[PDB]
Ligand binder design. Structure first.
Ligand code: SF4
Ligand code: SF4
Ligand code: FES
Ligand code: FES
Ligand SMILES: [Fe+3]
Ligand SMILES: [Fe+3]
Lengths: 633, 633
């Protein structure tokens, strides 16, 4: 089971699932082997009904698609559609938050409000929206209108790209025609250009894909901006993670998915419903998080994280998960089937994301509190049904310090330099105490033993004084293995990095260092890392492709993650990926994405399946950036 | 070669290609066999990097996707993405025409203008745009603004759906939540809901797909509306078709693709350039059409159609094709490679549609005339290079009467009844002279011997007094086999249908019948068939699903065609398809699309690979509609 997951609570539940005959994601992976090599290499196309077409990576025919599409066209078209799909997820999430903010300030949904007014004003100023002498509700209405306007062509480009990156970076992207014109406009154009008998030039196709990945970045940044306005900007918090946060005697309710418009209300309402839970024989409602909507409420409220990504079924196998409340993205639909065994009530809430066999509750922001009460009451009913039954909650959890929004990081730094908060960080980059910065992002993937790449790479970088930040299920992997417990700084961190984490934490009234890894939030909160790196670039007067900053999507899976990796490259970052995407069937495409894209954006993908080798390559990329700044390394 | 194409000019060029060693689309198809069965059945998914996943149609594992996606979810998700891609093509085409109209009436591109002012005003009234006392350029500016607004969410739904269908049909679709909210909005939502861990309910997924197909219908109807304003509404015209329209002694220039913003200018400018062509030793510029941009200029100007779809490479094999001017969609990228053998100059013109090895000329509407001159001058240079060389143009062509826009059809009918032009058609439906109406639409497909399904089905329906209309490459197949020559009415048409075609043609100053098949234009001009059928429904006071009207995509290929077939079903039409889409791996999905969708929209797919059986099934569907109206059959 150690070959399936490095997480000991997950291993325990894999043993329980096995002896109870519950098929898991790892079992379904085993039943898929050997997977199709044409698909694995990218050399397959089904974009018209003359297909399916395939191309042998080596040997004799077939060598070309029926319409004449070459290997490099087929591989680039498939990759572009993955980017467009990821953009569509992040921008659907952002669009739903824009409508929620608009409804809230139109009096249409009283459950929602402007919670962070400083953030609202700072966003309005960044967009050029006048604030002076304006009601907050009219400023927010204009911000919401600007958000929805970035989805279509207008007389400006997408502002959640052009106003969030350094001007030199915007200029470089504009010169290559990479600035998106509208978020859903770019998604549709990808789908058009990749359909049969359209774009058939690998370089042209991939340039389109880089532009669509920036539409994804805009969606991410919009999503973070809007969630902070509505629900509050995160600040440092303390909580726990892994299956042991479930409580046999409570109603255990998991919020799962990505959009917290729902889950944030669940958090609030569950508090009110406690006496109603106590009347059923429970201690109260224990809300726990799975995946990114779990990160959202962990970041803002300290809701403990139960599990993530590939291991999500394991929370149900405990037998103590009374309900799992779904919005959309990264939900294994298997949960609807597994629930018939474990008794969990699986509830979908979004019209475009239903699962056969799950109970659906039509959430509407206009009725959010009423919907949450109905949903929580199903969970209390479920708890009563397992009264007195035995559950197996692994007694395994870690301490998690999180909540490191970019604003929080800057505020924390401001305790060392009030008027120039970025300078203490750059000072320690220059003198070597901080070798560089690495963002860990993206998913787990059943192909990689769970968390193995994240932890192996992180340990090596932390020993080499790299400042490590993480989001999404990369934050999930590191949190479940103790990388967000400040008690582990001595074991994990090089002396230079330890000195810096200690100096900052002590100045922030803690007597102890910051944690070894800074948790920057959900998958859309990769935009927070952009904001920090962009602020560093502007403070240093250089573009992002000169900073000692890299990213690693060490175990990535989702089309969303493919989009994030692509815009990390497009904004100028060396970007390691730990599962090969379907590009190896075309050497020219692989060559563009791993080498020659350097000449366009300054970033590049680093393909490396072996995590020890990946860490070496990431250090080499960081150290080459140091050399380009004339720094020692 | 008869097994590859039923077209005798194509067979001749297949023999030439074979003895010259030029690989064709049929050769590349042969090199693909046996094609992958998982892809053919729909039972394959690559929507995340844990894939590729497949499901055995029968037998043992794999039985389910790694994430838990079932056969019915995987099949519905793949189909939804095909619909979204088709919508993206038709709506990209429409969007480009909306920007062209906007530029033209802003003084930004003098090559373009309001050519059809009656159409502009009728569209403005249908949209509710005030015309009274307004400059034409301001009315058109408002129409163009309304077109671009339908691409995104706003306070109205997509008007190019809700204002073009009968109100009872709109009410039925609204009740099932099928009315699109915005064209690119629906495309993005499909891409989101079909990404991993999102929508996992076949019925929910397919309902989303029906709504996205209506976004495609809107794109088609917008494209037709805008092209008619800019370039003129078609009226009856006479021309020729097939390879024999090439002329050994002329500069032969093929316009190929879909959007005529380019090709319409080429037609105009080539006339001016004739003396410059004569100076090179040619008789002048012989502009000919391939695919839908060929249909556009055939419809408006009588440009002869050279070939279509699967056989497009054959025009080059003659050795007389001096240039082929491309915009986007359905262009086999093989043409760039074949041109190195045949000497043809292949020129791309659109930024998002390039082909490696082809010359690119950056067309802009602001510079349309200058660009066309540069492009035509490359063609004249190419003609000079083959001076005195021998070419092989098959001496094969047909007479084509075309130009049957819905306005033209109504005007033609108005000669039998001035104040009630639809009534003579309905009269002959009621008395049996016209059994029903069949629209032939969509592509050729290398899997089907070229044109075999279209002609076999058409002959049987015409013998049974069905009024047959056609668009796109269905019009192309019927035109190349003489179905648009009125001289063939005696041979082809039942006595009732012949009487009606004769009565109409004679009243329109022709001494002869209308042609056996009415050519209604390009693929986007399927919207014209909608307008006619909607007018018939409104005149009869019934919904479309009560009319004796069916469609047949007899040899379909493109994602665009999948979208068209799906909205034909969604607006209430029995819709035959002659190549199986990847749905047979899921019986529940097949059952929805062929039977139970009847209960939602009244339309349904008719899957039938055998064209003789298909014609029987189409007649049965028509006759069941007749019975529901209490008509004899
Ligand atoms: S688009 Fe070309 S390569 Fe793809 S399935 Fe169709 S014929 Fe094959
Ligand atoms: S989305 Fe599910 S079925 Fe598709 S590739 Fe990923 S794991 Fe496999
Ligand atoms: S041939 Fe297996 S992915 Fe298509
Ligand atoms: S297994 Fe062949 S289409 Fe994927
Ligand atoms: Fe996740
Ligand atoms: Fe075509």
């Amino acid at each position: 089971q150690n070959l399936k997951s490095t997480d000991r609570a997950v291993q325990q539940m894999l043993d329980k699932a096995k002896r109870e005959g519950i098929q898991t994601v790892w079992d379904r992976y085993e039943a898929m082997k050997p997977q199709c090599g044409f698909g694995e290499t990218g050399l397959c196309c089904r974009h018209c009904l003359q297909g399916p077409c395939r191309i042998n990576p080596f040997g004799d025919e077939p060598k070309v698609g029926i319409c004449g599409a070459t290997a490099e066209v087929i591989v680039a078209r498939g990759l572009d559609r993955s980017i467009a799909a990821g953009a569509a997820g992040h921008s659907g999430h952002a669009k739903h938050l824009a409508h929620t903010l608009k409804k809230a300030v139109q009096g249409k949904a009283a459950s929602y409000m402007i919670k962070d007014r400083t953030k609202l004003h700072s966003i309005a100023k960044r967009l050029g929206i006048p604030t002076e002498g304006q009601k907050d509700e009219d400023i927010a209405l204009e911000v919401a209108k600007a958000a929805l306007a970035d989805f279509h062509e207008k007389d400006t480009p997408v502002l959640w790209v052009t106003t969030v990156l350094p001007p030199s970076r915007v200029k470089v992207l504009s010169a290559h025609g990479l600035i998106p014109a509208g978020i859903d406009h770019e998604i549709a154009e990808i789908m058009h250009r990749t359909s049969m008998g359209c774009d058939a030039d690998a370089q042209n196709l991939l340039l389109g894909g880089l532009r669509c990945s920036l539409a994804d970045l805009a969606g991410c940044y919009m999503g973070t901006d809007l969630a902070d306005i509505l629900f509050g900007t995160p600040a440092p918090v303390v909580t726990e993670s892994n299956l042991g946060v479930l409580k046999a005697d409570a109603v255990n309710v998991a919020v799962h998915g990505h959009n917290p418009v729902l889950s944030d209300i669940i958090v609030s309402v569950s508090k009110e419903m406690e006496n109603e839970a106590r009347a059923a024989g429970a201690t109260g409602i224990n809300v726990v998080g799975i995946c990114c909507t779990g990160n959202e409420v962990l970041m803002r409220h300290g809701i403990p994280a139960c599990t993530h990504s590939v291991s999500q079924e394991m929370a149900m196998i405990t037998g103590a998960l009374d309900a799992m409340i779904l919005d959309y993205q990264c939900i294994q639909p298997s949960v609807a089937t597994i629930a018939e065994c474990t008794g969990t009530t699986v509830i979908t809430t979004m019209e475009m994301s239903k699962i056969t066999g799950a109970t659906h509750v039509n959430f509407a922001e206009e009725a959010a509190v009423e919907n949450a009460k109905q949903i929580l009451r199903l969970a209390i009913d479920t708890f009563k049904r397992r009264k007195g039954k035995p559950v197996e909650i692994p007694n395994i959890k870690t301490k998690v310090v999180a909540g490191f929004s970019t604003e929080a990081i800057i505020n924390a730094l401001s305790k060392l330099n009030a008027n120039d908060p970025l300078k203490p960080l750059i000072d320690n980059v220059v003198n070597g105490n901080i070798r560089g910065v690495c963002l860990f992002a993206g998913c787990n993937n059943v192909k990689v033993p769970q968390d193995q790449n994240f932890t192996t790479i992180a340990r090596k970088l932390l020993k080499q004084n790299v400042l490590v930040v993480a989001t999404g299920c990369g934050a999930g992997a590191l949190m479940r293995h103790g990388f967000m417990d400040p008690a582990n700084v001595d074991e994990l961190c090089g002396d230079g990095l330890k000195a810096v984490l200690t100096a900052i934490g002590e100045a922030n009234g803690l007597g102890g260092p910051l944690p070894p890894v800074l948790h920057m939030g959900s998958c859309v909160d990769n935009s927070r890392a952009v904001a920090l790196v962009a602020a560093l670039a502007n403070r240093l007067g250089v573009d992002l492709d000169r900073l000692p900053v890299v990213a690693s999507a060490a175990e990535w899976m989702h089309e969303k993650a493919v989009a994030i990796g692509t815009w990390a490259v497009t904004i100028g970052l060396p970007t390691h990926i730990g599962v090969l995407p379907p590009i190896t069937g075309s050497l020219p495409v692989t060559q563009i994405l791993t080498s020659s894209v350097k000449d366009i954006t300054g970033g590049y993908f680093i393909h490396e399946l072996d995590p020890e080798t990946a860490a070496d390559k990431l250090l080499a990329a960081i150290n080459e950036r140091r050399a380009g700044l004339g720094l020692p390394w």
